[PDB]
Amino acid sequence: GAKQVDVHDPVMTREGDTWYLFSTGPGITIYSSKDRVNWRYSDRAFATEPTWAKRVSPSFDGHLWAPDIYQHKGLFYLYYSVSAFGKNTSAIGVTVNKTLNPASPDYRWEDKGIVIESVPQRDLWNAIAPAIIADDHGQVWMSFGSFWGGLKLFKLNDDLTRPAEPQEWHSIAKLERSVLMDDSQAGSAQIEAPFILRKGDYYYLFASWGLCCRKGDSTYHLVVGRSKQVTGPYLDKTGRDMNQGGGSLLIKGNKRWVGLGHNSAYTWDGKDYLVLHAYEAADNYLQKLKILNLHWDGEGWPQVDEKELDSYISQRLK
Numbered sequence: 001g002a003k004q005v006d007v008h009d010p011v012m013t014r015e016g017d018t019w020y021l022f023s024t025g026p027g028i029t030i031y032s033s034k035d036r037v038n039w040r041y042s043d044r045a046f047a048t049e050p051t052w053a054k055r056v057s058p059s060f061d062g063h064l065w066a067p068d069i070y071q072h073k074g075l076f077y078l079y080y081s082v083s084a085f086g087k088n089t090s091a092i093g094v095t096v097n098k099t100l101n102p103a104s105p106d107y108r109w110e111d112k113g114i115v116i117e118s119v120p121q122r123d124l125w126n127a128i129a130p131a132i133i134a135d136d137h138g139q140v141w142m143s144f145g146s147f148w149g150g151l152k153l154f155k156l157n158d159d160l161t162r163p164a165e166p167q168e169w170h171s172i173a174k175l176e177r178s179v180l181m182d183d184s185q186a187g188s189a190q191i192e193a194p195f196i197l198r199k200g201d202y203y204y205l206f207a208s209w210g211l212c213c214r215k216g217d218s219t220y221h222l223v224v225g226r227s228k229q230v231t232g233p234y235l236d237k238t239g240r241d242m243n244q245g246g247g248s249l250l251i252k253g254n255k256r257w258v259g260l261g262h263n264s265a266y267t268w269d270g271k272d273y274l275v276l277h278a279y280e281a282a283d284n285y286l287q288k289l290k291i292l293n294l295h296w297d298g299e300g301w302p303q304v305d306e307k308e309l310d311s312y313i314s315q316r317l318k
Ligand SMILES: [Cl-]
Pocket: 009, 066, 067, 068, 129, 130, 131, 193, 194, 195, 262, 263, 264
């Protein structure tokens, strides 16, 4: 290729011998790769935009946020966020395809509409940044959230397009906020973008703390907690519940990478990987894809080598 690939809020999956990468961007931006390093543009999920997006977000600009990709019964489920900066006029949608290869006769994204929507003054959460997790009991869950009253988990219905009925919800992580604050304001609870990975006997909840998207002043970083059951509670290394501000440091930025986060995490062929964006100080703070090897310490906690922020170098192909 020649330049690193620029992404925000990345997720990944493999179909056959091809890797696919999904990013925040117009219609959700999709790339493909044979080796996880050299990436070509593949498609955008929506050629224009979801038919319903403007009614949720009247000033919608075409950019969909924070995708999650999930394989289930032979299909590909791509969750995506419609929102507006600074507000909780937001909704998570899902669109489904039979395959990820755009040359395939089976290739077509079909929107299934709104999974969940937040409404100002009704909901103390923000319906963005979905992540899908299955448990040991045949059930599938969505975690999501950003600012307001924090991160939530709810049970999905049988087709994975709406909340199961009757509904079942759980709070999984939170930072301080008084309800006397105006309901329309994001607050000081700088927590977002949950992602859950099952490893050994625990579920691990990753979350982003601090502020993204602000050049030299970004404080964005990753913290983690763990729970025996998918529904919590997620505790940190000191035994503090993430519902009361717990979370142990996984990785933070340095002089070259000022802010990093909004991660995913995967087990591929018996090894584990952390997938994130990081803002490159030497290139106008432009967010680059980073894939790091995910290790586990003697106490059962994830660990990464921050040197891989430099040695993992994606390439954008023609
Ligand atoms: Cl995400």
